[PDB]
Amino acid sequence: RSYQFWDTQPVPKLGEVVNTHGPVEPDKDNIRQEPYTLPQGFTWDALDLGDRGVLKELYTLLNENYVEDDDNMFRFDYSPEFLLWALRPPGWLPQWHCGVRVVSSRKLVGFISAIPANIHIYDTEKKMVEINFLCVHKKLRSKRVAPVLIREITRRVHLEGIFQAVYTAGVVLPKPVGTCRYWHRSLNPRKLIEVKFSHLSRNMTMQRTMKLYRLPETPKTAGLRPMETKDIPVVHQLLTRYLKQFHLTPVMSQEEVEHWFYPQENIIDTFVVENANGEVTDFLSFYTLPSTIMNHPTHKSLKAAYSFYNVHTQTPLLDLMSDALVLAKMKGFDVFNALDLMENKTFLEKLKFGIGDGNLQYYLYNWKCPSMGAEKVGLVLQ
């Protein structure tokens, strides 16, 4: 296999075993001041997401042209407020919300973003960016527009003095630093079967299936309650200590913890365990991301909850996640998704998650290190 674009990049070769931790290439000390050229009739436009009209155009581009499953049944449907949460965390920069418009119509047809993140990779901590929401309009696909978007965001990140990035993708590219698998816990099995998310699996009836996936009506962990403002510091402390066991993690300031965890309805939920002493000892979190269901006369949207960061010090992990399922169910979710990273393997089978189709590969740009098992990945991106 060759990669006409990826082969020119500072990433390791697929198939080479890596034994040397460090940058692929030295930092560039002068950077190109001019944007890379797009094809004729298209232009750059940095997108002001504080503008309601412009945020809606981005919502529409992603709603119509972002990630689908291999059979074109489901497409992510990130909401405008969720996009604002994802794309404006602390340290966000306007030039890192990189759009492509058609010159004549103004139509938004491409996007890529970067947000700043401190990343701990093995024994190094490095200021990086996280690249997300790369999207080319379906009518514009396969015209090598994706490499221009990647090069242009790279140049704009370089201008800010940053030379490493982290990203995930569904496809295998040079070269995954780790490979995760999605698993799903049914919460409304009837809808999931009706919309062909899952199959009636041999040999159980529908009635057996609903019974199998039935959950308690309220969580069982004593003192579980939503996170509040007073909890920001101890959620920050617990998260920092907990992550030290993994090899790829974020290093978040207290302000980033407030942004990523403080509850926002229909975007992010976090529940803490406040014990009999008033001490918060654990927390669970999950974010809300629906997917459009296409070509179906009755069901239009599948409501999914996604496991975020789950920190146990005193409640067993297995119990926290069981309460996470119960809460997702009570909130009206159809499915709970989680990856096999961190210590998630310890609960996935027990709590009746089924394996799904498709990997999520983790990558670093301009950094070589050995790859790691999923159990060592402790970074979750939206």
Ligand X SMILES: CCCCCCCCCCCCCC(=O)SCCNC(=O)CCNC(=O)[C@H](O)C(C)(C)COP(=O)(O)OP(=O)(O)OC[C@H]1O[C@@H](n2cnc3c(N)ncnc32)[C@H](O)[C@@H]1OP(=O)(O)O
Rounded to whole angstroms, the Cα distance separating 11 from 133 reads: 20
Residue 180 marked as a ligand binder: no
Between the alpha carbon of residue 270 and those of residues 276, 291, 300, 308, the distances in Å are: 20, 21, 27, 9
Residue 134 marked as a ligand binder: yes
Q: Give the interface size with Mg ion as a residue count (CB under 5 A).
A: 3
Transcribe 310-331 into DSSP letters.
Answer: -B-SSS-HHHHHHHHHHHHHHT
CB of 150 to ligand X, least distance (A): 5
Is residue 113 near ligand 646 by the rule CB under 6 A?
no
Q: Collect all residues with Cβ–Cβ distance below 8 Å to 212 and sequence separation of at least 6.
A: 189, 204, 352
Residue 5 marked as a ligand binder: yes
Is residue 365 near ligand X by the rule CB under 6 A?
yes
Kindly report the CA angle at 264 between 263 and 269, in degrees rounded to 5?
A: 45
CB of 377 to ligand 646, least distance (A): 13
Between the alpha carbon of residue 276 and those of residues 218, 235, 279, 320, the distances in Å are: 19, 18, 7, 17
The option from ligand 646, ligand X, Mg ion, none interacting with 117 (CB < 5 to 8 A, set by class) reads none
The option from Cl ion, ligand X, Mg ion, none interacting with 14 (CB < 5 to 8 A, set by class) reads none
Contact window for ligand 646 (CB under 6 A) among 61-69, 101-109, 248-256, 280-288: 61-69
Nearest residue to ligand 646 by CB is 170
For 106, counting Cβ atoms within 10 Å of its Cβ (0-12 exposed, 13-18 middle, 19+ buried), the class is exposed
Residue 146 marked as a ligand binder: yes
Binding mask 138-157 for ligand X (x = CB under 6 A): ---xxxxxxx--x--xx--x
68: which 2 tokens? 């689908």
The option from Cl ion, ligand 646, Mg ion, none interacting with 75 (CB < 5 to 8 A, set by class) reads ligand 646
User: Tokens 């994706």 belong to which residue?
Assistant: 146
Residue 9 marked as a ligand binder: no
Interface of this chain with ligand 646, residues 314 to 343, rule: CB under 6 A: 337
Question: Using the rule CB under 5 A, which residue among 106, 138, 143, 350 binds Mg ion?
Answer: 143
Is residue 145 near Mg ion by the rule CB under 5 A?
yes
Residue 237 marked as a ligand binder: no
Residue 92 marked as a ligand binder: no
- Based on CB atoms, which residue is closest to ligand X, 110 or 219? 110
Is residue 28 near ligand X by the rule CB under 6 A?
no
Is residue 358 near ligand 646 by the rule CB under 6 A?
yes
Question: Using the rule CB under 6 A, which residue among 39, 50, 170, 332 binds ligand 646?
Answer: 170
Q: Give the E-state strand segments of the chain in sequence order.
A: 42-46, 74-76, 97-102, 108-121, 124-136, 165-169, 178-186, 224-226, 248-250, 268-274, 280-288, 291-293, 301-302, 304-307, 335-339, 354-365
Rounded to whole angstroms, the Cα distance separating 290 from 379 reads: 21
Interface of this chain with ligand X, residues 55 to 74, rule: CB under 6 A: 65-67
Which of these, 266, 343, 340, lies nearest to 305 by C-alpha position?
266
Give helix 80-87 / helix 52-65 axis angle, nearest 10°.
Answer: 100
- Based on CB atoms, which residue is closest to Mg ion, 16 or 64? 64
What is the side-by-side strand order in the sheet with 291-293?
74-76, 291-293, 301-302
Residue 243 Cα to chain centre, angstroms:
17
Question: Using the rule CB under 6 A, which residue among 58, 87, 121, 162 binds ligand X?
Answer: 162
The single-letter code of the amino acid at 139 is K
Question: Using the rule CB under 6 A, which residue among 109, 119, 129, 320 binds ligand X?
Answer: 129
Positions touching Cl ion (CB under 5 A) are 4-5, 17-18, 144, 147, 186, 189, 192, 198, 370-371
Footprint of ligand 646 (CB under 6 A): 67-69, 74-76, 132, 168-170, 182, 184, 291, 302, 304, 337, 356-358, 360, 381
Q: Binding site membership for tetradecanoyl-CoA: which residues?
A: 4-6, 133-136, 142, 144-146
